[PDB]
């Protein structure tokens, strides 16, 4: 693997942050929420180091820079993230990203989810 003598085996001497995408990217709709949706993903198999938390893109523009784009931390490492108050029938860009005590790491590509529509007056 690679070379060289060992001793002081008191953790890590340094870490690598995530250069690799999540996977299990999903983006769902939430039930009777036409405005609020759910997006589900996994953390990568190289994980070079550890986790702490997530952060997740959306912009209604895809070729914006991503200085426009919002930035929505997720907290205790979770996995999953629900926007609220979005717009309806417009295309919607979400991207989600892995980022440890280190940093963040590349997006994924550009997920492409076109939101869902009001269905009937009843909802709740």
């Given at each position: 693997?690679?070379?060289?003598?060992?001793?002081?085996?008191?953790?890590?001497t340094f870490?690598?942050?995530?250069?690799?995408?999540?996977?299990?990217?999903?983006?769902?709709?939430?039930?009777?929420?036409?405005?609020?949706?759910?997006?589900?993903?996994?953390?990568?198999?190289?994980?070079?180091?550890?986790?702490?938390?997530?952060?997740?893109?959306?912009?209604?523009?895809?070729?914006?820079?991503?200085?426009?784009?919002?930035?929505?931390?997720?907290?205790?490492?979770?996995?999953?993230?629900?926007?609220?108050?979005?717009?309806?029938?417009?295309?919607?860009?979400?991207?989600?990203?892995?980022?440890?005590?280190?940093?963040?790491?590349?997006?994924?590509?550009?997920?492409?989810?076109?939101?869902?529509?009001?269905?009937?007056?009843?909802?709740?």
């Amino acid at each position: 693997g690679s070379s060289g003598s060992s001793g002081t085996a008191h953790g890590t001497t340094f870490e690598l942050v995530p250069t690799s995408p999540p996977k299990d990217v999903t983006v769902v709709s939430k039930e009777g929420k036409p405005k609020t949706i759910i997006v589900n993903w996994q953390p990568p198999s190289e994980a070079n180091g550890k986790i702490t938390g997530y952060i997740i893109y959306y912009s209604t523009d895809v070729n914006a820079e991503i200085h426009d784009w919002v930035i929505e931390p997720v907290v205790g490492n979770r996995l999953t993230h629900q926007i609220q108050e979005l717009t309806l029938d417009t295309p919607y860009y979400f991207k989600i990203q892995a980022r440890n005590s280190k940093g963040m790491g590349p997006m994924s590509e550009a997920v492409q989810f076109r939101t869902p529509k009001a269905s009937g007056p009843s909802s709740g």
